[PDB]
C-alpha cells in the first residue's frame, strides 16, 4: 500500500531517518492518522514540496522574494524537525506537538 524510500545520499546529508519524502507515499493517507495529527501535519507535505522546489535558490537567499524566502527558511527548519535519533520513538502525543 505504500513505500518509505530510504536513500543513501539523504542518510549522508544528515537527514536520518533518510526517508525521501515526496517520492515516499502511503495510499491509505489521512485515514491512518488521529485528527490532531491530520490538522497539524496536512500542510507539511505542501511546505516540504515547496522547499524541494526553492532549495536550488539557497545560494541567492537575499535576492529571492521575501514571501518565498519565508518558505525556504521554514523548509530548512522542517527538514531539521524531521531528523531523529535511533531508538528514540516519540509517542503520538509528543510528535503532534513536534510537528505543531
Amino acid at each position: 500500500d505504500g513505500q518509505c524510500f530510504l536513500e543513501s545520499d539523504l542518510f549522508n546529508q544528515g537527514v536520518r531517518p533518510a526517508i525521501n519524502v515526496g517520492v515516499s507515499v502511503s495510499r491509505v493517507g489521512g485515514a491512518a492518522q488521529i485528527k490532531a495529527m491530520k490538522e497539524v501535519a496536512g500542510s507539511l507535505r505542501l511546505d516540504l514540496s515547496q522547499y524541494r522546489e526553492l532549495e536550488a535558490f539557497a545560494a541567492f537567499a537575499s535576492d529571492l522574494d521575501a514571501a518565498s524566502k519565508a518558505q525556504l527558511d521554514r523548509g530548512a527548519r522542517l527538514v531539521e524537525l524531521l531528523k531523529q535519533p535511533q531508538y528514540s520513538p516519540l509517542a503520538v502525543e509528543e510528535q503532534v506537538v513536534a510537528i505543531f
Partner: peptide, 8 residues
C-alpha cells in the same frame, strides 16, 4: 509567480 511574485 513562485520565485518573484505576480508583480514581476
Amino acid at each position: 509567480i513562485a520565485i518573484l511574485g505576480i508583480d514581476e
